Subunit: 124 residues, 4 copies
C-alpha cells in the first residue's frame, strides 16, 4: 500500500533473563511502489516485555545528498512504541504504534530476524 | 563463523535522478553461535559511488539494560567504509571501515541488504 | 556542592515568534571540586514556552578514552525538562527537573548566555 | 564579526592520570549581529594531544520548530578538528574542521571554554 514500507532488522533471540531488555534494530528505506523519499531510517533500541510492553528506540534518518550537503544528511530522534493488544519472539511479534501515530507491524523469527512493514504518520 | 554476525537492512533501489548518494541502513544483533553481547547496532548512511566508492554512516549501538540503566544503553558513532582491504561497482561487495571491521553485503535489486559483519572491536 | 556541576551554554535570544521553539544548548563537564568522571555531556534542544513549559533535548555524553577505545566513547540519549513553578530569557531562567530526577538551574542572559548548575540523578 | 558566532562550553581540566583524551563540549546558538538561523549546535567530544593534536566530536544541531515538526528538528554529525589552517600545545588556539570551519577557543584553567565559531556551511 501507498503508506506502507518494508522493514527488516534483527533482535537478540537469546536475551538475558536478568531484568534486561532485549536489544533490537530495524531499517526502513523510504521507497515503496508509490513514493520514494530517497532516505532511510534505522531504529536501535530495546524491547521491554510484560503486560505493558514497550520498544524504546533512538533513530537515525539519513537522506541521500550531494557530498556538499552531506553534513546535513542525518536527523536523529527517539520513538517509543506501545504494543497493540499485548519469549522475545512472541513478545516482539505484533502491531505497535509510536507517539507520532506511526505503526510498526513486525514478526520476529526464531533465528533473530525481524520482518514487517512501517507506516509513518509524518514525512514522506 | 565465529567472528561473523548476520546483518539485514534496506537501501534506496531507485536513487534520485539528480549527484545524490544512495540512502541505506542495516542492523546487526550481536548474537551468533559463539557469543552473545546482548546488543544491536544500526548503521544509517549513504553510499557514494565512483572511482573510490564509500559508505558513510552514523550508528547507534543499544545494549539490553535494566530500565534504570536505560539512560546509558546507547552508544553513538560514525563509520566510513571503503572497499580497500587493510571489486565491481555498486553496494554489493566487501567493505572495511576505519576500525578494520569487515562488512560483506549483497544488495538486492528491490532494496534488500543482506550479509555479514565482523567487528574489529567489542564483543 | 558535591552533587552540583557548572554548566554553560547558549540560546537564541531573538527567537521566532511564529509558534516555533527557542533553540538552545549547554554543556556540563563532569568535574567539580568533589568528583571527576572524566566526561562531558552536551544537551541540544528547544524551549517550548507557555504555562506547561518544557525543554526537550537530545544529548551526547563523551568520556575521555584511549584512542583504541574511542569508538565506545559517546553515549546518546534524550531528556525532557519540566519547569518548577512556570521572553525566552524569563522563560528559560529557573529550575527544571528531568525524567531521571536530575535538576537544571539556569539563568538566561540578554546576550544569549546560559549559566547555572546541574545535578544528575544518575552516573558520576 | 559577520561570520563569527559566540560559543561557550566546558572541558575536563584535570583529565585522568592514565593516555586518556580530555572530554569537552561546547554550544553555538546561531544568532549574531548579522543573522539568526534560530538553531543551536552542541559538539561533544574529546581532545587528543600530542604532535598533531585533534578534537574529535559528534554534534547535535537543533532548530527551533513547531511541536508538530519537532521530530525533524535535530541533525546529527561528526566533526574532527586540527590546528592546520586549510601553535602552542593545548586546547586553547585556532582549530579547523573537515568542512573548513574555524573554531577559536580559550580554555580556562578551571574548565571553561569560550570563543567563536565560523561555519563554512549553513546559516
Ligand atoms: O521523510 C522521509 O525522509 C521519510 C519518512 C521519515 C519518517 C520518520 S522515521 C523517524 C520518525 N518516526 C516515525 O514514525 N516517523 C519519523
Ligand atoms: O560489543 C558489542 O556490544 C558488540 C560489538 C559492537 C561493535 C561496534 S558496532 C559500531 C562500531 N563499528 C564497528 O565496526 N564496530 C563497533
Ligand atoms: O557518569 C558520567 O560520566 C557523568 C554523569 C552523566 C549523567 C547523564 S548526562 C545525560 C543524562 N541526563 C541526566 O540528567 N543524567 C544523565
Ligand atoms: O544553518 C544553521 O542552522 C546554522 C549553521 C550550522 C552549521 C553546522 S554546525 C555542525 C556542522 N559543523 C560545522 O562546522 N558546520 C555545520
Amino acid at each position: 500500500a501507498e503508506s506502507r514500507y518494508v522493514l527488516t532488522g534483527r533482535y537478540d533471540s537469546a536475551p538475558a533473563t536478568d531484568g534486561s531488555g532485549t536489544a533490537l534494530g530495524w531499517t526502513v528505506a523510504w521507497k515503496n511502489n508509490y513514493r520514494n523519499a530517497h532516505s532511510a531510517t534505522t531504529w536501535s533500541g530495546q524491547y521491554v516485555g510484560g503486560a505493558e510492553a514497550r520498544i524504546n528506540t533512538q533513530w537515525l534518518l539519513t537522506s541521500g545528498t550531494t557530498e556538499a550537503n552531506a553534513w546535513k544528511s542525518t536527523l536523529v530522534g527517539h520513538d517509543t512504541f506501545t504494543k497493540v493488544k499485548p519469549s522475545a519472539e512472541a513478545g516482539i511479534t505484533g502491531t505497535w504504534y509510536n507517539q507520532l501515530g506511526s505503526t510498526f507491524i513486525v514478526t520476529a523469527g526464531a533465528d533473530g530476524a525481524l520482518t514487517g512493514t512501517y507506516e509513518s504518520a509524518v514525512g514522506n
